Amino acid sequence: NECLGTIGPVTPLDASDFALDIRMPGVTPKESDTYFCMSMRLPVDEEAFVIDFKPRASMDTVHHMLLFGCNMPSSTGSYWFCDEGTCTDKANILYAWARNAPPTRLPKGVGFRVGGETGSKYFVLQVHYGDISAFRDNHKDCSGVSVHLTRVPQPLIAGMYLMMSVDTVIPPGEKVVNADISCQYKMYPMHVFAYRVHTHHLGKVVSGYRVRNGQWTLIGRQNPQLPQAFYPVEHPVDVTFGDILAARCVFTGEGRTEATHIGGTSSDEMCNLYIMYYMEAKYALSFMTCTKNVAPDMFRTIPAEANIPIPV
Ligand SMILES: [Cu+2]
Ligand SMILES: [Cu+2]
Ligand code: NI
């Protein structure tokens, strides 16, 4: 009893707010550990602000959910299979829901800008099912997310600073392989309030830092084998013009017969750190990406914790 039926996906909230429900179209996964995607055009063409997210997940069957904004979803039609292949243009992550790692709300006054001339025209929802119990009866699943949108401009604008490896090669059996990422920050100040890490099975630890005058300030560090939620930052951290952002993923090659490189499958790897930030509305940009390592030598003074795993 979650599929919306005759009422549809759009609930008016007041004069300038509405909830948009983004739901799987009554799907039934045949195999276990399945990744479904679907998209929705924004109903409004003009600029809007996403100011809250409420999960609508079947607590039996849903392992994780991700919601992106983009302009070109990978597929048209109802739903598709997406082993993390959501958009053809760049997919902007907005929200992660993981089982056993409950999400944290956006700070009040903070929203993502979407729609209009430059914002995302589509949402893409990815749902990872995992365990196919309770699907015995072959019931239709309508899991996803209810998104609160408003036309009211927000004083603070949420954005994403994505750090990702592109060139990493993990030789087979190799005990430790480091993937290092670094860029100089050249925008108005951002304040990091949440982070998410992502590797595949070879990832041991992922850490990100702001480097200012050789001083390393921790943004977040996580075991990527733990649920890949957005975790709150322990202390709010500003990144300002002249700062360097730095991240290290630690991988092992133990267990593999052949080299492992970066790519989109499970026998490939990724080193992704998603740094969620707010900015003053008049200075804000919605996304930044670092795919480089501009200060490789700086990593000589990376804190020792970046090399040590988290005790599970
Ligand atoms: Cu999952
Ligand atoms: Cu991946
Ligand atoms: Ni501050």
From Swiss-Prot:
Binding positions (Cu(2+) 2): 198, 200, 270
Subcellular location: Cytoplasmic vesicle, Secretory vesicle membrane
Consequence of changing residue 64 to A: Impaired Cu(2+)-binding; forms a closed conformer in the presence of citrate with a reduced Cu(2+)-Cu(2+) site separation of 4 Angstroms. Abolished peptidylglycine alpha-hydroxylating monooxygenase activity
Chain sites annotated for binding Cu(2+) 1: 63-64, 128
Region of interest called Peptidylglycine alpha-hydroxylating monooxygenase, as start-end residue ranges on this chain: 1-312
Function: Bifunctional enzyme that catalyzes amidation of the C-terminus of proteins. Alpha-amidation is present at the C-terminus of many endocrine hormones and neuropeptides and is required for their activity. C-terminal amidation also takes place in response to protein fragmentation triggered by oxidative stress, promoting degradation of amidated protein fragments by the proteasome. Alpha-amidation involves two sequential reactions, both of which are catalyzed by separate catalytic domains of the enzyme.
Assembly and oligomerization: Monomer. Interacts with RASSF9.
Name assigned to this protein: Peptidylglycine alpha-amidating monooxygenase
Naturally occurring in which organism (per UniProt): Rattus norvegicus
